[PDB]
Amino acid sequence: HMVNSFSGYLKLTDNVYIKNADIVEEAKKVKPTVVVNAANVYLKHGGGVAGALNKATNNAMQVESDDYIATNGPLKVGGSCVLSGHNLAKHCLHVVGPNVNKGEDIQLLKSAYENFNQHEVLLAPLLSAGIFGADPIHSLRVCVDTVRTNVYLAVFDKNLYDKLVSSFLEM
Numbered sequence: 755h756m757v758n759s760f761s762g763y764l765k766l767t768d769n770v771y772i773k774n775a776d777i778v779e780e781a782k783k784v785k786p787t788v789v790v791n792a793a794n795v796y797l798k799h800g801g802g803v804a805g806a807l808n809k810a811t812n813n814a815m816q817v818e819s820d821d822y823i824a825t826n827g828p829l830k831v832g833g834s835c836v837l838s839g840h841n842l843a844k845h846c847l848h849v850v851g852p853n854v855n856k857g858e859d860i861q862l863l864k865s866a867y868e869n870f871n872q873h874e875v876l877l878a879p880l881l882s883a884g885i886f887g888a889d890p891i892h893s894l895r896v897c898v899d900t901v902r903t904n905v906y907l908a909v910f911d912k913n914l915y916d917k918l919v920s921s922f923l924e925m
């Protein structure tokens with residue numbers, strides 16, 4: 755036992771790894787330097803990954819997020835900010851993917867993944883792929899084509915994990 759030690763990930767490419775896991779359980783076990791949040795521009799951590807991370811910090815992430823946004827104003831779609839990882843990680847990189855359910859520009863998903871290249875190693879979810887309504891296969895593709903640093907993707911759903919791995923390791 756040490757820190758940033760990932761286990762049970764499938765190596766997709768030289769720098770992209772994928773596991774069927776809860777990003778919160780992975781954060782707790784690994785204590786990564788950086789865990790990524792699938793955030794909105796307001797850092798209102800209502801559901802999905804954001805709700806699960808915030809709940810595991812006993813709401814400390816939401817209190818910090820409320821203070822940050824009241825001070826700085828909202829993020830841009832495709833942007834990020836580095837805040838505390840609380841009890842889960844050294845840092846949390848809050849990254850805003852486009853909300854395609856509200857017609858936001860899918861091109862901003864590439865801008866969102868570009869934020870990952872500022873960090874050597876990240877534990878991350880598939881951006882925009884849940885509540886934000888992007889195709890998860892497309893989100894994995896943009897991740898693989900954009901991110902050059904080491905990214906460990908945690909995919910909660912068993913069936914989604916199997917679909918992502920089979921489509922990737924065919925195409």
Ligand SMILES: Nc1ncnc2c1ncn2[C@@H]1O[C@H](COP(=O)(O)OP(=O)(O)OC[C@H]2O[C@@H](O)[C@H](O)[C@@H]2O)[C@@H](O)[C@H]1OP(=O)(O)O
Nearest residue numbers: 776777792794799800801802803804882883884885886910
């Ligand atoms: N605990 C978890 N660990 C790992 N992955 C997780 C976990 N919970 C959900 N996911 C997955 O992450 C992906 C991203 O889903 P969301 O967390 O909904 O992020 P997205 O970028 O789609 O939506 C962001 C919005 O979701 C709101 O919660 C947040 O405050 C913001 O407004 C989906 O494939 C989502 O899968 P699903 O569609 O919820 O089954």
Ligand SMILES: [Mg+2]
Nearest residue numbers: 884910911914
């Ligand atoms: Mg699901």
